[PDB]
Amino acid sequence: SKNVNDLITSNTTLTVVDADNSKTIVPAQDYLSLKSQITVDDKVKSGDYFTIKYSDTVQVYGLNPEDIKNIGDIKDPNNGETIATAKHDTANNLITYTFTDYVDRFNSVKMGINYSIYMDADTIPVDKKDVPFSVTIGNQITTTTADITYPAYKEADNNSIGSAFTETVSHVGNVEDPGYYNQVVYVNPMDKDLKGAKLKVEAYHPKYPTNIGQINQNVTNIKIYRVPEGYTLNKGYDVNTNDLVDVTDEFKNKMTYGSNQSVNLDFGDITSAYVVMVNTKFQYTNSESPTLVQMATLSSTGNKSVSTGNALGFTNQEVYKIGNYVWEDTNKNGVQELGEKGVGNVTVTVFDNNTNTKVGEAVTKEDGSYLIPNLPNGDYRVEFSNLPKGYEVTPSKQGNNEELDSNGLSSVITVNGKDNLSADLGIYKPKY
Ligand SMILES: [Ca+2]
Ligand SMILES: [Ca+2]
Ligand SMILES: [Ca+2]
Ligand SMILES: [Ca+2]
Ligand SMILES: [Ca+2]
């Protein structure tokens, strides 16, 4: 088991996508498209591993940290097998992929990845031109740049405010735990002297009567921090709380929950900026496409009230695959071995063996692969036919391993809670 970064080579693209066509690049709105075709040296063996490292300005999820699951094992799309398993170490900006026995069973291994990844605002607190974003696949660095341009804080007279959703874990349709979301509110980011300041945060908007936002004393947790003099707030709403002064204890008597998913924070007379962190639980919903809206309004004496807010939309038996290999069993021993190659143009026909009803069919590709999808748990008869002329069927069920043997022309396999890729056929062509 060793690092084989020097035994892969890739054609990689890393592209900044202006997702909202704003003509500006903002971490909260835009994203990075990473694509790579990776060629793996034949010397690589199972348990070897390669890494994908990304720069400090890159992260592998957006608002939902559970989206890390979208960047997972690398699979062969033709035959359904896993080529390498993925392990994230987000603290080290690292993905480690460990090769499976795929690379012991096949030469000329090639892999594709197609990921959406995200910009990390942690080190981009303000507008900056030519910010680099880098991904290192094996030993090859792919670097792209973009100008980062954040929106301005909302203002009304001497009142100013900003807000963003910073984390959303939504389980739409789950009654036990609908999930949670976090919002950050910058209070008075323009650093003014405001008289009788009050902040109203509300999961309420007249346009959204089915809002799944929720604010009340039982589900909501609020932290308040004072911003030191001269501190530059992160315009991407990445808050390093160690840089700020926790003043949550000072907002007893000043914290009031109210109707329509509201909470009111009485700041009084203030001369600094404040960061308000709001953690709260989603409401449950039956709907397929719910909406979350949460507003924040700062009011003070002698100034127009300023409002800002954020809005987001969300989304709400098992079947499996059978396969997957017809190969030319050169040494006739009935066992799939490295260097023996797949056979194309062989017909596979699959039946539910308990009803004798046809459930799928395929023709093997040039690499010998086939897949039969959409099969629930059951017993399935797999019939091979239309072998190449001159070829004979190799001996069946050799080698004491039903994943590496030949099933013969007709056999029955059981699908039980996972893909069953063990219905394989070995053939050879006699010369004598
Ligand atoms: Ca944009
Ligand atoms: Ca290999
Ligand atoms: Ca063999
Ligand atoms: Ca088998
Ligand atoms: Ca197989």
Curated annotation (Swiss-Prot):
Name of the protein in question: Serine-aspartate repeat-containing protein D
Domain CNA-B: from-to ranges: 319-430
Disulfide bonds: none
Origin: domain of life: Bacteria
Membrane-spanning residues: none
Assembly and interaction partners: Interacts with host DSG1; this interaction increases S.aureus adherence to keratinocytes.
Function: Cell surface-associated calcium-binding protein which plays an important role in adhesion and pathogenesis. Mediates interactions with components of the extracellular matrix such as host DSG1 to promote bacterial adhesion to host cells. Contributes to the resistance to killing by innate immune components such as neutrophils present in blood and thus attenuates bacterial clearance.
Cellular compartments annotated: Secreted, Cell wall
Similarity field: Belongs to the serine-aspartate repeat-containing protein (SDr) family.
Part of the whole protein covered: 244 to 682 of 1385
Gene: sdrD
